[PDB]
């Protein structure tokens, strides 16, 4: 099979932390794939805790670094017609949204496709067209955005319906690890020049959900899906009907009421201790993502952490949680 791949990304210090002359309690060694955490009191004499992962990215890591090393190869596996999922897990403030979506460079310096602050989602969407136009390709791309807040479901892309309309989920008669979500719109991305405006209506729906729901950005989970239908007409006339799906999953903040977050953890524990009963059905998140958790999807986790000492307790919690998950076997 294939173990879940787990990478760590430490955010850099911000303006205020630099101004307070903050010293990092985290040391990342990408060559050894190690993160070392200062856990005791002192700085010239110190107990430390180290963890090995599949990859480690320190505070210096840029969006392009993450894209080249992590996204690209997974996108290739999607294009070869397989299912893949990437989770972002970590405490609020550590760069889950930064990693998955990214931000705009200030002062209108760049356009969306060349912005260095762009995260996984736009980079993926751009590259799918850039690579698939390049070869002989009859292909189609569809996106959806399903969000979970308090075990209720929301479509954050659909220009027709408004965000406050809850959706309903049902089991899928013709798919065992699968569900049907009534009212979730899949949107056809016809070409690379439709991408941004589709994202923009999403960004607007996000603001309304934040107005409607308490701490929505921290307590919600989003599942951004992109589906590629391929019948590549290369240069021979060949065409094999392959379908690839990519779920980009921005989890609710892990910091110490959230049934989906509680159930993800118990599912992970069941899977790693190989308990016969895995409680998938105990939350919306784990039903929707059942195949990503010990199923037939290639799954990666990006665990985000802080360099600051103030965050020590939550950083260790994140590291231990993520480390456990390396033992999950997928197919
Ligand atoms: N790798 C990074 N590089 C630069 N800034 C970052 C990084 N990770 C997080 N940040 C910053 O930290 C703050 C919180 O990041 P955000 O993506 O909102 O985290 P989360 O979604 O996990 O709460 C933002 O100001 C963001 O710019
Ligand atoms: C600038 C605001 N934007 C882009 C519309 C985003 O916040 C955003 C994303 N950002 C981006 O697409 C980019 C950042 C920098 C260059 S392009 S990806 C994404 C959203 C919102 C969402 C609800 C549609 C989910 C996926
Ligand atoms: Mg966030």
UniProtKB/Swiss-Prot annotation:
Post-translational modification, as annotated: A subset of this protein primarily localized at the spindle pole is phosphorylated by NEK6 during mitosis; phosphorylation is required for mitotic function.
Subcellular location: Cytoplasm; Cytoplasm, Cytoskeleton, Spindle pole
Residue ranges of every copy of the Kinesin motor domain listed in the record: 3-328
Residues bearing PTM N6-acetyllysine: 131
Residues that, per the record, bind ATP: 90-97
Family: Belongs to the TRAFAC class myosin-kinesin ATPase superfamily. Kinesin family. BimC subfamily.
Binding partners and assembly: Interacts with the thyroid hormone receptor in the presence of thyroid hormone. Component of a large chromatin remodeling complex, at least composed of MYSM1, PCAF, RBM10 and KIF11/TRIP5. Interacts (via C-terminus) with the kinase NEK6 in both interphase and mitosis. Interacts with RARRES1 and AGBL2. Interacts with TPX2.
Reported disease: Microcephaly with or without chorioretinopathy, lymphedema, or impaired intellectual development: An autosomal dominant disorder that involves an overlapping but variable spectrum of central nervous system and ocular developmental anomalies. Microcephaly ranges from mild to severe and is often associated with mild to moderate developmental delay and a characteristic facial phenotype with upslanting palpebral fissures, broad nose with rounded tip, long philtrum with thin upper lip, prominent chin, and prominent ears.
Function: Motor protein required for establishing a bipolar spindle and thus contributing to chromosome congression during mitosis. Required in non-mitotic cells for transport of secretory proteins from the Golgi complex to the cell surface.
Protein name as it appears in the record: Kinesin-like protein KIF11
């Amino acid at each position: 099979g294939k173990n879940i791949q787990v990478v760590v990304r430490c955010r850099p210090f911000n303006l205020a932390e630099r101004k307070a002359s903050a010293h990092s309690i985290v040391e990342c060694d990408p060559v050894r794939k190690e993160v070392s955490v200062r856990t005791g009191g002192l700085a010239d004499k110190s107990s430390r805790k180290t963890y090995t992962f599949d990859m480690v990215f320190g505070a210096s890591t840029k969006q392009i670094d993450v894209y080249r090393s992590v996204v690209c190869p997974i996108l290739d596996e999607v294009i070869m017609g397989y299912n893949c999922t990437i989770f972002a897990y970590g405490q609020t403030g550590t760069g889950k949204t930064f990693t998955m979506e990214g931000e705009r460079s200030p002062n209108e310096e760049y356009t969306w496709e060349e912005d260095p602050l762009a995260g996984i989602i736009p980079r993926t969407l751009h590259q799918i067209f850039e690579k698939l136009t390049d070869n002989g390709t009859e292909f189609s791309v569809k996106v959806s955005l399903l969000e979970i807040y308090n075990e209720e479901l929301f479509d954050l892309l659909n220009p027709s319906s408004d965000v406050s309309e809850r959706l309903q989920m049902f089991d899928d008669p013709r798919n065992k690890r699968g569900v049907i979500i009534k009212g979730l719109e899949e949107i056809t991305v016809h070409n690379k020049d439709e991408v941004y405006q589709i994202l923009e209506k999403g960004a607007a729906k996000r603001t309304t959900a934040a107005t409607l729901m308490n701490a929505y950005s921290s307590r919600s989970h989003s599942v951004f899906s992109v589906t590629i239908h391929m019948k590549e007409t290369t240069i021979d006339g060949e065409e094999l009907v392959k379908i690839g799906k990519l779920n980009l999953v921005d989890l609710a903040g892990s910091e110490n009421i959230n049934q989906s977050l509680l159930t993800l953890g118990r599912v992970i524990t069941a899977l790693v201790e190989r308990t016969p009963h895995v409680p998938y059905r105990e939350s919306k998140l784990t039903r929707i993502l059942q195949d990503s958790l010990g199923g037939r999807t290639r799954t990666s986790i990006i665990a985000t952490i802080s360099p600051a000492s103030l965050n020590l307790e939550e950083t260790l919690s994140t590291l231990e949680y993520a480390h456990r998950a390396k033992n999950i076997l997928n197919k």
